[PDB]
Design a protein around this ligand. Structure first.
Ligand SMILES: Nc1ncnc2c1ncn2[C@@H]1O[C@H](CO)[C@@H](O)[C@H]1OP(=O)(O)S
Ligand SMILES: [Cl-]
Length: 211
């Protein structure tokens, strides 16, 4: 008999923070979908309700996933789960810093900027890691807000990596506009980023989800 691991580890936002971020995300999607610059790109295909477009949303509490384990069937699962830092941090409260919200034609999410301590909990063996894309470790860290109907797991992280590639190289450009919470950037190809004037800090508990 082998101990059967979680579906995935991550930081699970407290009820309060989760609700707070969920609303922020919804307002962002509502505001963005109504923004002149977005509609203009959109009509470059009327008005699209982004909340409906990104219809597959996390049903339970929002979270920032570290290692997907699939109960042990995922590669590197047992190795990740038996890490000292993971055991020590299990059930521990953290604050996750959210610096931006983004959308693409596939996903809507929040960019997480992990601390070095929290970075110790970040998987060392992701299938498509930041390092493979010239970005610092843990840059893929995120809270998914919503996904298009046929968008599979993990896409949100990949999408963030791609967006962070656009800002790194400089493709950020001038803000095309501004929403109450910050400056809005068009990265082209349906990619949009709201750079928060004030970083959002969410309380979350690091633990394992079993489904
Ligand atoms: N390879 C993967 N397969 C499934 N989920 C993954 C994988 N990698 C990371 N995840 C994450 O595990 C959670 C539940 O699936 C989700 O949060 C996945 O990432 P998300 O961007 O939120 S869709
Ligand atoms: Cl990464």
């Amino acid at each position: 008999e082998k101990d059967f691991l979680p579906l995935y580890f991550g930081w699970f936002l407290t009820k309060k923070s989760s609700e707070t971020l969920r609303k922020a995300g919804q307002v962002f999607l509502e505001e963005l979908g109504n923004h002149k610059a977005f509609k203009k790109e959109l009509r470059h295909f009327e008005k699209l309700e982004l909340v409906s477009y990104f219809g597959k949303r996390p049903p339970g509490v929002l979270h920032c996933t570290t290692k997907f384990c699939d109960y042990g069937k995922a590669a590197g699962a047992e190795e990740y789960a038996q890490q000292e830092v993971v055991k020590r941090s299990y059930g521990k409260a953290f604050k996750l810093s959210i610096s931006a919200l983004f959308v693409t034609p596939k996903t809507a999410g929040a960019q997480v900027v992990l601390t070095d301590q929290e970075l110790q909990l970040w998987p060392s063996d992701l299938d498509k890691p930041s390092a493979s894309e010239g970005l610092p470790p843990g840059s893929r860290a995120h809270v998914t807000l919503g996904c298009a109907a046929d968008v599979q797991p993990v896409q949100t992280g990949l999408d963030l990596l791609d967006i962070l590639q656009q800002v790194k190289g400089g493709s950020q450009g001038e803000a095309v506009g501004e929403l109450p919470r910050g400056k809005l950037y068009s990265l082209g190809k349906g990619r949009w980023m709201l750079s928060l004037t004030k970083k959002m800090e969410v309380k979350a508990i690091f633990t394992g989800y079993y489904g």
